[PDB]
UniProtKB/Swiss-Prot annotation:
Function (record text): Histone demethylase that specifically demethylates 'Lys-9' of histone H3, thereby playing a central role in histone code. Demethylation of Lys residue generates formaldehyde and succinate. May have tumor suppressor activity.
Localization per Swiss-Prot or TrEMBL: Nucleus
Entry protein name: Lysine-specific demethylase 3B
Full protein stretch here: 1380 to 1717 of 1761
Record text about domains: Leu-Xaa-Xaa-Leu-Leu (LXXLL) motifs are known to mediate the association with nuclear receptors.
Binding-site list for Fe cation: H183, D185, H312
Annotated organism of origin: Homo sapiens
JmjC domain segment(s): 121-340
Disease: Diets-Jongmans syndrome: An autosomal dominant disorder characterized by varying degrees of intellectual disability, developmental delay, short stature, and characteristic facial features such as a wide mouth, a pointed chin, long ears and a low columella.
Signal sequence segment: none
Amino acid sequence: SMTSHSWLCDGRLLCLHDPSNKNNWKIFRECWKQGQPVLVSGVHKKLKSELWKPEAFSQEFGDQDVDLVNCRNCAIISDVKVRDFWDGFEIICKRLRSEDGQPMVLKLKDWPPGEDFRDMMPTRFEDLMENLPLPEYTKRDGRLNLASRLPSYFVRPDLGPKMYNAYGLITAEDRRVGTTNLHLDVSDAVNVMVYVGIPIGEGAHDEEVLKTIDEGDADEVTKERIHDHKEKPGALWHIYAAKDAEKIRELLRKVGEEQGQENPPDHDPIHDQSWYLDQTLRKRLYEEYGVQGWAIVQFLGDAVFIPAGAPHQVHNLYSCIKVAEDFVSPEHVKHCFRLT
Ligand SMILES: [Cl-]
Ligand SMILES: [Cl-]
Ligand SMILES: [Cl-]
Ligand SMILES: [Cl-]
Ligand SMILES: [Mn+2]
């Protein structure tokens, strides 16, 4: 039976089922005021699927110059064509190879660049912005988005949206690597999974994905969306409450010191964007500092809401196209204030 919502993370995470339901705000706002993330499923059913394919991005924009990141070692591949990324998105025999002769796991950096999404891709911009869930919060001029209404005493977000494109992590060694390392944002964000590419060539890569979700601490209900509904899983997130950010800095300064880093006692390991919390570090955070997070699997068409100030990291299971919009809710405006 169709239902308005359900719970993940053993009741700690709201999952809304109908992205365009005019009554969603009634269920959302209680959870949001407490500093919790929220998941909304089904956004892919609202979109024009032909606008969000890797082959279309390659055909239309393939001659642009871009930099890539090697996710395994953080090395930068400078000044290549954007088709060199897109044509290896699903077909492994077309990926750029490292020295060892293996195909690389690549992230496309800052594309489209800065604030240029709307000018470069007007039809994509319209399709996304007209179908975002919780539109009073998430649209540029929504009644509950303060972004356009605040003075310079507040850090204001850039004009969006921002696209996040990267291959899936593959091997057992890759389990400990991030697609996007642990960081925080002073604005709220909504992050939509618009495409998941499950490859061919080294296709049959199903079993390392299940060990990653299990060791990642995913709940039993999330393990059912795979085995029962056959939905496409994109990315594993870990999100932490804004109130736990300083305890996470204390753990990472202790671990940086153990690993022979020489950092001043006040340096900020979250702002540095240099860490990925693997199974070992997530257990140490819980046991030694008393901090629990939310482990979230983002499937095709899932919208993740990330509260301002909340530390979070992202690990792609398969090749992903994500599109994210920043906003400033009244519930979390304290996090972008420039005084006290
Ligand atoms: Cl808060
Ligand atoms: Cl377009
Ligand atoms: Cl709303
Ligand atoms: Cl990163
Ligand atoms: Mn972020």
